[PDB]
């Protein structure tokens, strides 16, 4: 009874007007079926000389519309994402991932659909289970006479030559185009000629502006025109508009396995080329290869073994050699040409790559030659990685001269024939050089960080300080993994007392070896217990804002340390509902709870041999919630902000998925290493018979990060044998660097890596088991993981036999779509108590009225001014922040301040690393909007900062002025500087006020 069928025609086109369907292809037959049980709408179809199959989601379509035509009653399904299109090579009535099949490739030019209706039959009209959305006009239209290639890459748009526009502008409209805002074929050589006859920026905020509508703009001329007859009015100009040298803009471009994707010139960390090539910056993409609803490409869509030819030879479905030829020879848009660049580990993990577009004075051969001298490599994959290593997001530092820098020898050690490097990947560096460092990095030149993960040169590791003078900072024979003549020293980041969090993995690897569930219960308890307190005490709001980074939740930590609450503010009470939401959320769907005893730190060597073999130092920062309770049986020293563990402490890192990647150690406190000024490293033994970060899951201080807890309750008594790595030593053939090895190996990885299969099937045998860690089944795919990990080395193939991968799905992942069972272990009785509270502590309806009221104290007397001089600065931030939370798909203001969003996207309600890329690029955004804004208010007298700060709270809160606004978070965005006149308000300033 999941059966709704019909077999009609099919029109893929446009609309070029309200009523005015355009189509460019026309195929008959076409058998279009329904089922809501997974939100699909299918479209079986016959073309010339084979089957086919459009499969479309709900959480896709725009609109759907009905008779509306001559002969028949159709449907327009305006799509925001092109529909999957599979095909048949097995034999059965086993499916397929193939591009598209229309001659002229219409299948992404054409972003409309209509499915007529069989009038001769009109079997059953199929409005059941679609989402209808207004009524149309009437039948439809013809001419449609593109006929172009555009490079295989389609839908694009050019100007024509009789015209000259920036190139963001062009990239602007094409990503219009893709969204569906903008008509194809409607932008005609009027249309480029009244955008040239505007500026640059009032094109951005028209396009901002317009891309908010959720239909067509079918008369664009009369859009722009009235809008540069508005923007031109509300004031002449404006002030300063960018002032600082901020993060670049990236133009993302998706690739769809049947159509290209634009995406607007966003905010971003750079990495090195880019901001050395500065302003061919506008050349360089950012280009990922995703599936066809910007889900992640999914490795059974490069190659299946249908079952029905179930052999080996996985055959490299046509989506393969698509992206391959488009990934050798390049696609034209517009202007400029695209050829291929590089790519780095994370963007190979991300499934993305840099694409150039080379011209006269630059080419990506010249790109790769400043790079390095990468000429003599005879291995694939090292080449790679290795070419990849320049490509990280970092906060370029100034260059390091070659009398600097000097090579110290590397600490080696062999047992019994087997060799061991002690440091690779982490060198000295001088405090002054250090202070210096982090000086242009943001950071408190008082307290540099210990340490600091970085690629330089041909390096890749960690460099941590050192009292020691008479240098700048280290070299190491372990770190060079090319050769290149780079002088300038990124930073990927550096080290921070980050809280603990025990993922899923992590406990999981306690559970297995004795520690019992009850404590992980407790400590889930107390998290919730204080999540639930923060919602109405000063305390325990404090508490749970103390462990979420962000400049958000230091704001708000002022603002609770003054006095405030959120029954009086409203801006507090959003910012803390939008915290305690996420962080229950989060709670629940990845058992990402608090762990109040531990830290996560990145890894430290010892240097000077003086500690020995199975005890580490450790000396972290006491936090907030422990400058009350100072007296504990794990501190050795003391000196007020800062302290020392010393109890048996274990440590390990994710992912981990062996039983003894973790390893408990005991704790020293050296005085001289102490005395050395290092901080929040674990530092490590320089001796010993074997590398104790070696004996971890892979094992290296190659800028890793290990979680490492004191807790007496989560210690283990006895652990097992670390393991060994020795698995690849690679070396194959083809004796040269050619561009076509790194195209082939780079898809290699795409089509063979499962990392996240081989976690989650890890997880799910070790909750099915008695052992949980020391199953059969669970050693092997330990094993395969780090082999699979193994391919940013060697390149061997990622195998993930059948026989393993779970068909079945316990409860704790909450996915709706596969065959679920309740849990018995561990983490599934958490997230069962997790739920269970929830539902159970669901009650917030009885708080109250929390409506707020303007506080008749945070004012200045004399503000009676600066409420026009104010109100525009506010109106156009309040406009910035609206665009950023339109781009983002964010809609309200706490979703997209927390950096998190409510309403989620198809794309990330599935992957977890891609959304934490999109969370930790909106916090990069949100964070150089803030920066703006205190400009804003620097540019100001600064003996008129209080009086400016306080007309924007009286504009934003007080009900006479905020009525229609839907924005209170703009004053407290410099509360550093607001709040404290509140000191002023209550320091003698009334009879009694506060003394």
């Not at 079952?307 to 391959?324: A, D």
Request: proline share 5%.
């Amino acid at each position: 009874l999941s059966l709704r069928a019909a077999s009609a025609s099919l029109i893929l086109g446009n609309r070029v007007a309200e009523r005015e369907l355009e189509v460019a292809y026309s195929c008959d037959g076409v058998r279009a079926e329904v089922i809501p049980r997974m939100r699909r709408v299918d479209l079986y179809l016959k073309h010339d000389s084979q089957s086919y199959k459009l499969e479309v989601l709900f959480e896709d379509i725009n609109e759907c519309f009905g008779c509306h035509l001559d002969g028949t009653g159709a449907i327009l399904l305006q799509l925001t994402y092109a529909p999957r299109i599979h095909i048949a090579i097995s034999g059965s009535t086993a499916w397929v991932r193939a591009l598209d099949f229309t001659p002229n490739s219409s299948f992404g030019e054409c972003s409309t659909l209509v499915l007529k209706l069989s009038k001769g039959a009109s079997v059953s009209y199929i409005l059941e289970s679609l989402p209808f959305s207004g009524e149309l006009g009437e039948l439809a239209i013809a001419s449609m006479d593109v006929f172009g290639s555009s490079s295989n890459v389609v839908p694009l748009v050019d100007c024509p030559n009789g015209f000259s526009v920036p190139y963001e502008v062009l990239f602007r409209l094409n990503s219009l185009v893709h969204m569906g805002k903008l008509v194809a074929r409607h932008v005609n050589a009027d249309l480029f000629k009244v955008l040239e006859d505007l500026s640059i920026d009032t094109l951005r905020r028209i396009f901002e502006k317009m891309s908010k509508l959720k239909s067509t703009c079918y008369e664009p001329l009369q859009f722009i025109r009235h809008e540069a007859h508005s923007m031109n009015m509300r004031k002449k100009a404006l002030s300063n508009k960018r002032e600082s040298g901020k993060l670049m803009r990236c133009y993302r471009i998706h690739i769809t396995p049947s159509k290209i994707y634009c995406l607007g010139p966003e905010e971003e960390v750079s990495n090195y080329v880019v901001k050395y090539h500065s302003e061919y910056a506008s050349d360089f993409a950012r280009v990922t290869f995703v599936d066809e609803d910007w889900s992640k490409l999914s490795p059974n869509a490069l190659s299946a073994r249908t079952e029905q030819g179930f052999f080996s030879k996985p055959l490299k479905t046509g989506l393969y050699h698509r992206i391959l030829s488009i990934l050798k020879e390049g696609f034209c848009i517009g202007p400029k040409k695209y050829e291929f660049l590089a790519f780095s580990a994370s963007q190979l993990r991300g499934n993305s790559v840099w694409m150039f577009a080379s011209n006269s004075s630059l080419t990506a051969e010249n790109i790769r030659r400043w790079m390095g001298h990468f000429e003599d490599i005879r291995s694939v994959s090292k080449c790679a990685a290795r070419m990849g290593q320049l490509f990280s997001s970092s906060r370029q530092t100034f260059e390091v001269s070659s009398y600097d820098v000097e090579v110290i020898p590397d600490i080696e050690v062999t047992t019994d024939g087997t060799k061991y490097i002690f440091s690779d990947g982490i060198g000295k560096i001088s405090t002054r050089f250090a202070r210096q460092v982090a000086k242009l990095i943001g950071l408190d030149p008082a307290h540099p960080p210990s340490a600091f993960q970085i690629r330089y040169g041909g390096y890749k590791g960690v460099i941590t300080i050192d009292p020691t003078s008479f240098f700048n900072l280290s070299l190491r024979p372990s770190m060079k993994k090319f050769e290149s003549k780079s002088t300038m020293l990124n930073i990927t980041n550096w080290s921070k007392s980050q809280p603990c969090y025990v993922n899923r993995e992590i406990i999981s690897l306690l559970s297995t070896l004795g520690i019992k569930d009850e404590v992980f219960e407790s400590m889930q308890q107390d998290d919730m217990h204080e999540s639930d307190g923060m919602l109405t005490n000063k305390e325990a709001a404090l508490s749970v804002l103390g462990k979420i980074g962000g400049g958000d939740t230091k704001t708000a930590a002022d603002m609770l340390l003054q006095g405030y609450e959120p029954s009086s503010e409203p801006y507090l009470l959003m910012i803390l509902k939008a915290h305690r939401a996420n962080r229950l959320t989060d709670i629940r769907t990845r058992c990402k709870i608090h762990v109040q005893k531990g830290r996560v730190l990145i890894g430290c060597l010892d240097e000077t041999c003086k500690l020995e073999y199975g005890q580490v130092y450790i000396r972290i920062t006491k936090n907030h919630k422990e400058q009350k309770y100072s007296e504990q049986p794990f501190f050795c020293n003391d000196d007020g902000k800062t302290a020392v563990i010393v109890g048996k402490v274990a440590i390990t890192k994710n992912p981990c998925l062996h039983p003894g990647d973790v390893r408990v150690l005991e704790a020293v406190y050296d005085p001289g290493l102490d005395a050395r000024g290092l901080i929040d490293c674990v530092v490590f033994p320089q001796r010993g018979e074997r590398p104790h970060p070696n004996e971890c899951s892979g094992g290296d201080l190659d800028g890793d990060l290990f979680f490492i807890t004191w807790d007496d309750k989560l210690i283990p008594e006895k652990v097992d044998a670390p393991m060994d790595y020795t698995a690849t030593r690679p070396r194959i053939m083809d004796h040269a660097v050619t561009l076509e090895e790194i195209q082939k190996h780079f898809v290699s990885y795409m089509i063979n890596d499962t990392l996240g299969a081989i976690s989650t099937a890890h997880l799910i045998h070790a909750d099915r088991d008695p052992l949980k860690a020391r199953s059969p089944e669970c050693v092997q795919l330990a094993a395969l993981h780090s082999m699979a990990v193994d391919f940013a080395k060697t390149g061997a193939p990622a195998e993930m036999p059948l026989a393993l991968r779970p068909r079945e799905f316990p409860d704790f992942m909450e996915r709706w779509e596969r065959p679920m069972y309740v849990s018995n272990g561990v983490l599934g009785k958490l997230y069962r108590a997790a739920l269970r509270h929830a539902a159970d502590a669901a009650a917030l309806l009885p708080a109250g009225p929390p409506s707020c009221v303007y506080d008749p104290d945070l004012e200045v007397a004399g503000f009676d001014e600066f409420l026009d001089a104010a109100e525009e600065r506010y109106e156009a931030y309040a406009e910035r922040l609206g665009a950023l939370m339109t781009y983002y798909s964010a809609e309200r203001e706490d979703e997209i301040l927390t950096g998190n969003i409510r309403n989620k996207l198809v794309y990330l309600r599935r992957d977890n690393k891609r959304y934490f890329e999109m969370k930790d690029r909106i916090i990069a955004a949100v964070d150089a909007l803030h920066a703006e804004v205190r400009g804003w208010l620097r540019a100001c007298k600064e003996d008129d900062a209080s009086r400016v700060a306080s007309a924007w709270y009286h504009v934003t809160y007080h009900p006479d002025r905020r009525g229609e606004k839907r924005f209170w978070s703009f004053p407290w965005i410099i509360c550093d500087t607001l709040l404290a006149i509140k000191a002023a308000r209550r320091c003698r300033k009334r009879v009694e006020d506060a003394a």
